[PDB]
């Protein structure tokens, strides 16, 4: 069901949740004045979500959430990324360098407090009502200078909601010694990771296991050999009852962003400019890189990660436009605003029609600059690798002028390090020249002479319109076109060589225009934001927050719905649950993506599923639900009707990507790893009995 609900809206949403099958009592999942299941949820390491699943502070989150730190502890002897990691005792649990978890300790509404403060700002057009500095200052004199010394490991944050119409203060509790407990091998954690990205049906065992460690009194403390496993306020029980079609599911976690209150015109701009240019430019770039990857196995190895990373937003943009073109997103937002316009007429307040008109006229006024901005970001800043090649810093310029030969060598030696990082083991100038030529050709076809970053004017003015020659010339003459050319420069360095270096000139000219456009464009956000406040104010006055959730803003939210499959197109039906069969069916030993761990293959051939199989003896893997999810929900606990853990969220299907603008009941699904599959992997792949005994597993 629709919405990323604030914890303080649990009350208002409880009847609609009970109707969907919720059995738990309200105060059992969120109490402002007590302990609740909220207290078992964590913001894992800045972006992900995690959940506390034991009394000794064991935490589950996604594999891809715990990936960098699994990778860090991986040597060539002990390759935990590949093989997995199973700490046989608490003391073998590996600590981590730059990790955190954040419990949300308290949440208070402070709208009245914050609105009164703002009321003493003379300036009507002040953007302080959304400025995080300003809100942090209002926070610090609420909790009192000096709160964080007096309350150790606590902090406070105020955030704006519904476009400045609601404010909340969050009391956070951050633990910093979070150790690696367990991970499946990556063949299970990233099964089908590139190909099945955004795909249901899905077969990916996407979990990793950590523990929160603190001082002897359970207080936040950075890594110290004397730290001990935290006792949490509350943890999640692990259900073994499984899921079935139509079962209630709900999720809690930290969604990043939505655009639920976009005007029709804003939707048009997102489709026309933001998404279409992403799509066009990344097609071109992806074509050339596909072509060069097939011709050469060594290019294939070097470009994989760059290609698939470009591919991630590409397919997101494809999904979103498919929803805009087929599911009536634009008409939905036109309707909602027309509805407020009519209601606002009848009330005698033209304010709302004013706000809508203001967003419209602004959107249309900034169309060209935004088109230009997207063309450059997608085409060049991301499109072309040599766009991100070294510029000398003003400090390095200064040392290359005048005098000191030790300072001259020092400035050079750290340009060497930047050059080395641009032209690394994965960079190929030859590929980059071909990608540049195609992107630049499309850029020049779209962006007229008078609006070109300066160096790109030379294609007409000097190479007679020959884009291949211009690009060949940048590599031929430039100190960064090859190692030997850089060395030649380093031996006899001079600021006048760098000043006239055509790659440097291209790079800095391109970034100049990128900056200048950002800047011209920034002043147009403010009127839209101000009108957005007025617009959302009206939607709330008219219809209430009952069925109008606040845009996501990296805050703790709940969403509820059902375990349900769907139909993606004529005559094809996807069900609610995948199985270990689908893993077997997808095995390709000659492709890293679809490798099947030998221990898992063997668990499948003996049907050694134990208490984790379903009725009918199938081994569950994943399931999907009508729950409303987005970036930031990676790793969120999924609960059944009694609040017991039934899985971890790890993706959305591509048909649900326009869900950020409008929930799609018949298409949008959260894709969730089945907790029974999690336990199976721990039990029969890791052998790690102790942490099963640790969890409170319920029938």
Q: Classify residue 467 by its DSSP letter.
A: H
In this structure, are residues 603 and 684 in contact, taking their beta carbons and an 8 Å threshold? yes
Which residues, in sequence order, are bridge partners of residue 48?
44
Q: Is 402 helix (H, G, I), strand (E, B) or coil?
A: coil
For residue 645, count other CB atoms closer than 10 A to its CB. 24
In this structure, are residues 467 and 316 in contact, taking their beta carbons and an 8 Å threshold? no
Alpha carbon of residue 651 to chain centroid: 11
Q: Point out the catalytic residue in the list 206, 268, 360, 683.
A: 206
Rounded Cα–Cα distance for residues 629 and 325 (Å)? 21
Q: Point out the catalytic residue in the list 1, 39, 64, 674.
A: 64
What are the backbone dihedrals phi and psi of residue 321, each rounded to the nearest 5 degrees, phi first? Answer: -65, -35
Q: Please report where in the chains the tokens 């071909």 appear, as a residue.
A: 434
Rounded Cα–Cα distance for residues 138 and 110 (Å)? 10
Name the token pair of 361: 């006229």
With a CB cutoff of 8 Å and minimum separation 6, the contacts of 123 are: none
For residue 466, count other CB atoms closer than 10 A to its CB. 13
With a CB cutoff of 8 Å and minimum separation 6, the contacts of 66 are: 180, 183, 208, 209, 210
Closest CA to 232 of 42, 63, 45: 42
Q: Point out the catalytic residue in the list 186, 239, 310, 634.
A: 634
Rounded Cα–Cα distance for residues 340 and 516 (Å)? 37
Query: 36 catalytic, yes or no?
Result: no
Closest CA to 212 of 44, 72, 38: 44
In this structure, are residues 211 and 228 in contact, taking their beta carbons and an 8 Å threshold? no
Alpha carbon of residue 323 to chain centroid: 20
Rounded Cα–Cα distance for residues 269 and 275 (Å)? 9
Backbone dihedral region for residue 74 (phi beyond 0: left; psi -120 to 50: alpha; all else: beta): beta
With a CB cutoff of 8 Å and minimum separation 6, the contacts of 301 are: none
| 408-443 burial: b if 16+ Cβ within 10 Å, else e | beebbeebeebbeebbeeebbeebbbbbbbbbbebb
State the method.
X-ray
Rounded Cα–Cα distance for residues 288 and 88 (Å)? 48
Rounded Cα–Cα distance for residues 648 and 675 (Å)? 7
Provide Rg for the chain, Cα atoms: 27
Query: 455 catalytic, yes or no?
Result: no
Query: 634 catalytic, yes or no?
Result: yes
Documented resolution in Å = 2.5
């Amino acid at each position: 069901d629709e919405g990323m609900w604030l914890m303080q809206q649990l009350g208002r949403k409880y009847a609609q949740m009970k109707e969907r099958g919720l059995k738990m009592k309200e105060y059992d999942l969120y109490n402002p004045n007590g302990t609740s299941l909220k207290d078992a949820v964590v913001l894992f390491d800045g972006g992900c979500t995690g959940e506390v699943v034991s009394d000794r502070g064991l935490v589950l989150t996604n594999h891809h959430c715990g990936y960098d730190m699994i990778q860090a502890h991986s040597t060539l002897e002990h390759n935990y990324l590949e093989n997995g990691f199973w700490a046989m005792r608490e003391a073998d649990e590996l600590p981590n360098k730059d990790i955190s978890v954040v419990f949300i300790d308290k949440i208070e509404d402070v709208t009245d407090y914050v609105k009164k403060e703002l009321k003493a700002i003379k300036d009507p057009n002040s953007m302080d009502y959304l400025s995080p500095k300003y809100l942090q200052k209002l926070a610090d004199k609420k909790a009192g200078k000096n709160f964080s010394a007096k309350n150790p490991g606590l902090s406070v944050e105020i955030k704006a909601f519904y476009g400045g119409n609601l404010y909340l203060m969050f009391t956070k509790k951050t633990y910093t010694d979070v150790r690696l407990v367990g991970a499946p091998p990556s063949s299970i954690g990233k099964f089908g990771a590139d190909t099945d990205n955004w795909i249901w049906p899905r077969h990916t065992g996407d979990f990793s296991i950590f523990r929160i460690y603190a001082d002897k009194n359970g207080n936040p403390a950075p890594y110290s050999e004397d730290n001990v496993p935290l006792k949490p306020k509350r943890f999640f029980n692990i259900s073994l009852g499984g899921v079935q079609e139509n079962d209630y599911a709900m999720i809690m976690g930290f969604p990043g962003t939505t655009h639920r209150y976009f005007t029709a015109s804003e939707v048009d701009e997102w489709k026309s400019i933001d998404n279409d240019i992403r799509i066009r430019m990344r097609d071109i770039r992806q074509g050339v890189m596909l072509r060069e990857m097939l011709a050469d196995p060594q290019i294939k190895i070097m470009y994989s990660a760059k290609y698939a990373a470009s591919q991630n937003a590409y397919k997101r943009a494809i999904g979103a436009n498919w929803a805009i073109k087929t599911r009536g997103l634009r008409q939905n937002k036109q309707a909602m605003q027309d509805r407020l316009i009519a209601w606002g007429a009848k009330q005698g307040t033209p304010r709302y029609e004013e706000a809508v008109h203001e967003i419209d006229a602004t959107v249309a006024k900034r169309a060209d600059l935004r088109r230009r901005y997207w063309m450059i970001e997608e085409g060049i800043i991301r499109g072309i690798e040599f766009a991100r090649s070294p510029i000398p810093t003003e400090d390095e310029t200064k040392a290359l002028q005048g005098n000191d030969a030790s300072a001259r060598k020092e400035a050079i030696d750290k340009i060497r390090t930047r050059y080395s990082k641009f032209a690394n083991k994965d960079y190929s100038a030859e590929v980059d020249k071909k990608v540049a030529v195609a992107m630049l050709t499309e850029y020049l076809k779209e962006i007229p002479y008078e609006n070109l970053p300066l160096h790109l004017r030379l294609v007409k003015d000097r190479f007679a319109g020959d884009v291949q020659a211009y690009v060949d010339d940048i590599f031929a003459r430039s100190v960064f076109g090859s190692e030997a050319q850089f060395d030649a420069f380093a031996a006899v360095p001079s600021v006048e060589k760098l000043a006239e270096d055509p790659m440097v000139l291209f790079a800095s000219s391109v970034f100049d225009e990128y900056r200048k456009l950002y800047n011209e464009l920034r002043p147009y956000d403010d009127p839209i934001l101000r009108a957005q406040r007025t617009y959302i104010a009206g939607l709330l006055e008219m219809d209430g927050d009952q069925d109008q959730f606040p845009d996501a803003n990296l805050t703790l939210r709940f969403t509820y719905g059902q375990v349900k499959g769907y139909s993606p197109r004529d005559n094809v039906y996807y069900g609610h649950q995948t199985t270990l069969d689908g893993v077997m069916e997808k095995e390709d030993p000659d492709n890293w993506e679809f490798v099947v761990d030998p221990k898992l293959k063997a668990v499948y051939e003996r049907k050694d599923f134990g208490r984790y199989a379903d009725r009918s003896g199938r081994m569950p893997v994943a399931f999907c639900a009508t729950t409303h999810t987005t970036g930031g929900n990676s790793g969120s606990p999924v609960m059944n009707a009694n609040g017991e853990l039934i899985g971890l969220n790890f993706d959305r299907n591509w048909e649900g990507v326009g869900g950020d603008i409008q929930y799609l009941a018949d298409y949008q699904r959260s894709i969730i790893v089945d907790i029974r599959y999690v336990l199976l992997v721990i039990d029969k792949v890791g052998g790690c009995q102790r942490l099963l005994d640790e969890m409170n597993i319920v029938p």
